[PDB]
Amino acid sequence: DIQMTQSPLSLSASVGDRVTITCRATQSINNWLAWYQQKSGKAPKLLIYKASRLESGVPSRFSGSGSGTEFTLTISSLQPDDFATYYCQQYGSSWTFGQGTKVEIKRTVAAPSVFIFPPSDEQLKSGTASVVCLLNNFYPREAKVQWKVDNALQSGNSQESVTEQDSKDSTYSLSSTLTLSKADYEKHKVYACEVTHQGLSSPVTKSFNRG
Amino acid sequence: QVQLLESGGGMVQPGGSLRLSCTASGFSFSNYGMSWVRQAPGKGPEWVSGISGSSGDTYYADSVKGRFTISRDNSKNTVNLQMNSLRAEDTAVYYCAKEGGFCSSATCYYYFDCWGQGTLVTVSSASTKGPSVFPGTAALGCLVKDYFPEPVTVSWNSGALTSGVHTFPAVLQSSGLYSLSSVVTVPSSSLGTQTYICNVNHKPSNTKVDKRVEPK
């Protein structure tokens, strides 16, 4: 019944940086704490066990410190292979995982390119209308997408999905899908998605009339 | 050479039951204790079940206590997890882990040093559905909507032109079907010059649908 809380949730860093991740337990777990590295599509790999012991084959740049309720993971000099998500795990009473710490690749700020797509004729003929707004190759990951139907901001009726940082240029890409019935789509004329982002000086509005 | 191999995952309806397996080799199965770790897509990993090497003491997670049943057959070097009354929240990727270091007692807590490849367990009222493909500078793409199950393979011009393509991860809707998109950026002056055809294949349904992207 011990809960593990990692800090920071996410941190963007550059190769060569010193990086420290904190992991806290509810109850005191002495020194029964492990750390793992996981890459997208791979099994997790043990880095450190018993709070301060390095797992065989893990690079010397990984170390760990702490006891009781407060623990740290430090990477002395971050390397390209090290961009990943890190989890701690206690085994002092049962087995519980932290929420994860994402190490994002640092790059310069990049504004998204914004596009809006009307539902296709092939889709409309079937009774459903999906309107898509694309934010292409941006940084940082934090971004706001807002849907406006006849210039009325939408909430609750959209879903979004975002890619991991591109391995060539370290940008993100993001999909947002608005789903309405064909009927409701045909009752209105002007569909607009307005995008605010840290790479954009002011919100960008992109807009069409259905015709 | 220590390795763990899972098996048994698949697709079940809510309320049904499923059974997993995990064949271990390379170490002394009798000595080390085992465990089952799962991770739901989009959340952090959680411990599910656990068993000792020889004593037979078993432990389960709070969210699955009473439903799952973990067992092992040291004579045949196998650990099995029985998953009864599966629910939507039980849909995750299930691993079998191995105790790290050693244990001086009979059953004890530990860290996981070796993992298996990972097996997939899906729980949904599976309405099997095929994928629906929809057709200065502007970007185009193809929208695949309402398909089951995963995955779908999208390629532009049979994998030739691939630069600037970004295929998005699918999302699950309250109806049970998936939806994703694959975009690509080109100068708008290449509408009639450059023809883009997305090749969406759905191996479970054996259905490929090509929708040519022509200037509208």
Residue numbers in the entry:
A (entry chain B): 1 to 94, 96 to 212
B (entry chain A): 1 to 52, 52A, 53 to 82, 82A, 82B, 82C, 83 to 100, 100A, ...
What did the study's authors say about this model?
Sporozoites of the human malaria parasite Plasmodium falciparum (Pf) express a surface protein, circumsporozoite protein (PfCSP), with an immunodominant central NANP (Asn-Ala-Asn-Pro) repeat region (1–3). Antibodies against the repeat can mediate protection from Plasmodium infection in animal models.
In addition to VH3-33– Vκ1-5–KCDR3:8, we observed a cluster of highly mutated, affinity-matured VH3-23–Vκ1-5 NANPreactive memory B cell antibodies in our selection. After the immunization of malaria-naïve individuals with PfSPZ-CVac, ~15% of PfCSP-reactive memory B cells showed VH3-33–Vκ1-5–KCDR3:8 or VH3-23–Vκ1-5 sequence characteristics. Thus, antihomotypic affinity maturation, in addition to traditional antibody-antigen affinity maturation, promotes the strong clonal expansion and competitive selection of PfCSP-reactive B cells in humans.
